[PDB]
Every structure is written in structure tokens, then in C-alpha cells.
Amino acid sequence: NLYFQGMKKEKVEQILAEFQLQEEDLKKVMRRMQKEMDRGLRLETHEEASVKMLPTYVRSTPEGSEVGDFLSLDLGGTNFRVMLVKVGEGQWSVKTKHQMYSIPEDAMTGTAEMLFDYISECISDFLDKHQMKHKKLPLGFTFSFPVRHEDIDKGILLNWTKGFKASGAEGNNVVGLLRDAIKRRGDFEMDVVAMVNDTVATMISCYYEDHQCEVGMIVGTGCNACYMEEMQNVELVEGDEGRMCVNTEWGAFGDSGELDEFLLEYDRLVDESSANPGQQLYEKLIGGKYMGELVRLVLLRLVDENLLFHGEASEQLRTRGAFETRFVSQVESDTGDRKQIYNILSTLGLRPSTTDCDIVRRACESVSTRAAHMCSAGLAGVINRMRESRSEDVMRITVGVDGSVYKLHPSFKERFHASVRRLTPSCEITFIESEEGSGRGAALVSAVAC
Ligand SMILES: Nc1ncnc2c1ncn2[C@@H]1O[C@H](COP(=O)(O)OP(=O)(O)NP(=O)(O)O)[C@@H](O)[C@H]1O
Ligand SMILES: Cn1ccnc1Sc1cc(C(=O)Nc2nccs2)c(N)cc1F
Ligand SMILES: OC[C@H]1O[C@H](O)[C@H](O)[C@@H](O)[C@@H]1O
Ligand SMILES: [K+]
Ligand SMILES: [Mg+2]
Numbered sequence: 001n002l003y004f005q006g007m008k009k010e011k012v013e014q015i016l017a018e019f020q021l022q023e024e025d026l027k028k029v030m031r032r033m034q035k036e037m038d039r040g041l042r043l044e045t046h047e048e049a050s051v052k053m054l055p056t057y058v059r060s061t062p063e064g065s066e067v068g069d070f071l072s073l074d075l076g077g078t079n080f081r082v083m084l085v086k087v088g089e090g091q092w093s094v095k096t097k098h099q100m101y102s103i104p105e106d107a108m109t110g111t112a113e114m115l116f117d118y119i120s121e122c123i124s125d126f127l128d129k130h131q132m133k134h135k136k137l138p139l140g141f142t143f144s145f146p147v148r149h150e151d152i153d154k155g156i157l158l159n160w161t162k163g164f165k166a167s168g169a170e171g172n173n174v175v176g177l178l179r180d181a182i183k184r185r186g187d188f189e190m191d192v193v194a195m196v197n198d199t200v201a202t203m204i205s206c207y208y209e210d211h212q213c214e215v216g217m218i219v220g221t222g223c224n225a226c227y228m229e230e231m232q233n234v235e236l237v238e239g240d241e242g243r244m245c246v247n248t249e250w251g252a253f254g255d256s257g258e259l260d261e262f263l264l265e266y267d268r269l270v271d272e273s274s275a276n277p278g279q280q281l282y283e284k285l286i287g288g289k290y291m292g293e294l295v296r297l298v299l300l301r302l303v304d305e306n307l308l309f310h311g312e313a314s315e316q317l318r319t320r321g322a323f324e325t326r327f328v329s330q331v332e333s334d335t336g337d338r339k340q341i342y343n344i345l346s347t348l349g350l351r352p353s354t355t356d357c358d359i360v361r362r363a364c365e366s367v368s369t370r371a372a373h374m375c376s377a378g379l380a381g382v383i384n385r386m387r388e389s390r391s392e393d394v395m396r397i398t399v400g401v402d403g404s405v406y407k408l409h410p411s412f413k414e415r416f417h418a419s420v421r422r423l424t425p426s427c428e429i430t431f432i433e434s435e436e437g438s439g440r441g442a443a444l445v446s447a448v449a450c
Pocket of ligand 3: 076143144145146161162197198199218220221222223224225249251283
């Protein structure tokens with residue numbers, strides 16, 4: 001009964017229809033986000049604002065930078081990265097040496113001491129591999145978490161995000177935590193000259209092939225953005241001349257109820273089983289840490305309604321984090337014959353039919369399209385805000401982008417761009433993907449700082 005396959009697919013659609021957002025739902029999200037951005041920039045409203053709009057102390061144009069050898073660090077994912085970059089006049093910057101280290105779970109959710117102990121050890125090993133523990137290299141730290149800066153080289157951790165939990169770190173100076181751990185070893189000795197967010201590093205690295213780049217966006221494990229604000233609008237910092245980079249931390253949009261009309265059963269479940277429940281709600285709609293898991297929960301509801309896999313879920317389907325976000329990419333990469341969907345599901349202990357496979361594709365499409373559209377309301381907000389703070393009628397702007405979801409998902413990018421463009425009339429937006437953008441961005445900022 002091919003009649004009874006399509007009826008299963010008609011009911012799957014009534015459920016999937018819940019992930020739709022109309023163009024006016026997006027304009028509403030966009031307005032409300034723009035409203036939170038305003039509140040985050042104001043001294044009077046900053047403390048209660050869910051979008052924090054944090055000053056980064058990376059000021060518009062700089063004066064002259066030093067040249068030579070820098071060491072970049074990158075902490076934010078489930079891996080920590082070290083790299084040596086050569087900066088030179090032309091401004092230009094090149095990746096010379098690189099090395100990535102997997103983070104022991106016990107350093108993610110143990111103590112700050114443990115975490116930065118592990119970080120320092122990696123730095124010690126790296127410098128050995130390349131006999132470098134003697135030149136006192138200037139160190140740039142890309143640290144992908146909300147920080148309140150007093151300066152380029154001094155700022156405190158506001159709260160962890162993305163499942164990080166190391167105790168004894170929130171409220172403390174992050175650069176100090178790094179410096180202490182280095183000194184605990186006898187390493188040693190780096191001049192830590194700059195700490196930046198990954199959005200910031202990505203914008204800075206894209207700037208040199210395109211001077212129009214004044215926005216940085218990350219859509220990886222988490223989702224965030226930064227942009228060049230007018231110093232007159234940054235009430236938290238002294239001075240009204242020139243421009244400064246602002247770290248939106250827009251992931252926390254919705255933490256005071258701003259997205260409530262849009263949250264689904266699946267989002268509440270994802271929020272409630274997370275390391276930070278009630279927090280980073282906008283990010284949990286978009287980021288790759290949460291995307292596959294959201295798809296998993298849709299498949300469980302489809303299984304419970306007798307619409308999928310004969311109404312039975314494998315032990316693998318019922319385990320946390322088992323539908324990887326990469327599987328969302330790989331399912332939507334399928335070229336029509338269902339073989340990629342088949343092997344993913346088969347490896348998950350399921351016995352899928354042709355129509356099971358197609359339904360799983362529809363679930364992935366529903367979840368990632370929503371992410372793409374929710375994300376576009378954020379960027380459009382930022383860019384509409386920037387058009388309105390400036391004098392020209394048409395704003396010509398470049399956006400620097402990194403993150404595995406934007407980069408590796410076969411169609412996120414195209415859905416995302418088209419939606420941004422419907423929401424940003426009178427803007428001409430160029431999107432560029434960064435090349436080793438964190439490390440190169442950190443060293444470039446460091447060269448000006450020292
Ligand atoms: N092929 C893929 N397509 C989409 N997502 C993926 C893919 N591979 C891995 N991911 C997910 O993307 C996340 C890693 O993204 P990536 O951007 O490489 O790291 P990141 O930039 O450190 N993340 P963030 O903390 O947001 O900056 C993981 O949570 C994965 O589940
Ligand atoms: C993005 N954009 C657009 C024109 N101005 C900027 S910001 C920008 C800032 C810095 C920079 O390092 N600024 C610093 N301010 C204080 C210490 S370092 C840079 N090294 C390169 C840049 F492009
Ligand atoms: O890694 C991307 C983003 O992840 C989380 O949202 C962090 O809070 C933010 O600082 C970072 O930029
Ligand atoms: K100011
Ligand atoms: Mg990152």
C-alpha cells in the first residue's frame with residue numbers, strides 16, 4: 001500500500017510544519033534582537049540585557065604593528081589549538097606550525113586548575129616539537145566564551161557556554177588563569193598580549209583580503225557574532241572617536257523569554273538535558289552542539305506515533321548525542337538513491353525502508369532550515385543596525401564566517417544567505433569564509449597590541 005506510505009508522509013508533514021517560520025516571524029525576531037542589542041549597549045540597561053554587547057577593546061584602525069613570530073592559542077571546542085604565525089609588512093600573516101590537542105573530559109568539567117594545567121602542558125610540548133621554549137614569543141589567546149574586558153589583555157569569564165564547566169573560573173581574569181598555570185610549570189614565559197573571541201579573530205583575519213569586512217560570525221558548535229560599533233554608541237567605554245569591536249553574545253537572546261512563542265517541545269528537552277539549562281537559548285536553535293540531538297528527538301516522536309521504523313527505536317537511537325550533527329549534513333548530501341541515509345541509520349541499529357529514509361531527510365531539512373532562518377534574523381539585525389548608524393543609502397559590507405555548520409552543511413549557507421538578503425534591503429552583503437582565521441586573527445591583533 002503505496003497509499004499507506006504517503007499517508008505516513010502526510011502526517012509526518014503535519015508534525016514537521018511546526019518548524020516553519022514565516023517572513024513576519026523572522027522580522028519580529030529581528031526587531032526584538034535589535035531591541036536587545038540597544039539595551040546591551042546602554043549603561044542603564046546593560047545589566048538586565050540578555051544580549052550583552054561586550055566591548056572587546058579592539059579599536060577600529062590601528063597604528064603600526066610589529067612584525068615577526070607570534071604564538072596563537074584557541075580554546076572553545078572539544079579541541080584546543082596551538083599555532084605559530086609569521087606576521088609581516090604588506091599586515092600579512094602565515095601559518096607556519098600548527099597543532100591540535102583533544103581535551104580530556106575531566107579538564108572540561110573538573111577544575112580551572114586542571115583545565116589550564118592541561119593547556120600549559122600542550123604549550124610546553126608544542127614548543128619542544130619546534131625548539132621554541134627560549135624566544136619569549138608574544139602570545140595571542142582566542143577564548144570563545146563571554147568575557148568582560150577591562151582591556152585587550154585583561155577580562156573576566158562571565159559564564160561558561162557549550163558544555164564547559166571547569167570550576168573556579170567564572171568571575172576571574174582568564175589571562176591570569178593562563179599566566180598562573182604557565183608559572184606553575186616553569187614552562188615557560190610568554191608575554192600574553194591579547195585575548196579575543198573567535199568571532200573577533202575571524203573578522204580580523206578576513207579584513208586583509210577584504211577591508212570591507214566589519215562583521216565576524218561563527219556557526220559551529222555555538223553561534224555568535226561581532227561587528228564594528230561607533231565609539232559614541234559604546235556607553236561602557238570612555239571616548240566617542242572612531243570605532244570598536246563589539247561581541248554580541250547573541251546566543252543568549254531568548255534567556256529572558258524573547259523567543260517563547262517559537263520554542264517547541266524538542267527545544268525544551270534539549271535545553272533541560274544540557275550543561276546550561278535556561279541559557280544560550282537562541283544558540284540552541286542553531287549551533288551544531290544541539291542540531292543533531294534536535295533531529296534525534298523528532299525521530300523519537302515520529303517513532304512514537306508509529307510513523308517511522310515500524311514504531312521501534314534502537315538502543316543507539318535512544319542514547320544521548322547519537323544522531324551527530326555531521327549526520328544531518330550527510331543525510332542532506334544524499335543525491336536521491338538513499339544510500340548515505342541508509343548506512344547512517346543502519347549503523348544506528350535500525351532497519352529502514354525507502355520511506356523511512358526520506359522521512360529522516362525531511363526531519364533534517366526541517367531542523368537545519370529553521371537554524372538557517374533563525375540565524376538570518378540575527379545577522380540582518382546587526383547589519384540593519386550598522387546601516388542605520390552610518391550615512392550612505394546603500395551599505396556595502398563584508399561578513400567573515402567560520403564554523404563547521406556554515407562550512408560543511410550542504411545547504412545551510414544558501415538558505416541562510418537568501419534569508420539574510422530578504423531582510424536587508426539597501427545592503428550589499430559579501431560573505432567570505434576565513435582561512436585559519438582564529439590563529440591568524442589572534443596574531444594580527446597581538447602584533448598591534450605589543
Ligand atoms: N560535517 C559537519 N556538518 C555540520 N556540523 C558538523 C560537521 N562535523 C562536525 N559538526 C559539528 O560542529 C561542531 C564543531 O564545529 P566547528 O565550527 O568545527 O568548531 P568550533 O568553531 O570550535 N565551534 P564554536 O564553539 O561554535 O566556535 C560539533 O559540535 C559537531 O557536532
Ligand atoms: C575590522 N576593521 C575594519 C577597519 N578596522 C577594523 S578593526 C582592526 C583592529 C585591529 C587591532 O588590532 N586593533 C587593536 N586595538 C587595540 C589593540 S589591537 C587590527 N589589527 C586589524 C583590524 F582590522
Ligand atoms: O564559538 C562560538 C560562540 O560560542 C558560544 O556562543 C560562546 O559563548 C561565544 O563566545 C562564541 O563566540
Ligand atoms: K563611548
Ligand atoms: Mg570557534
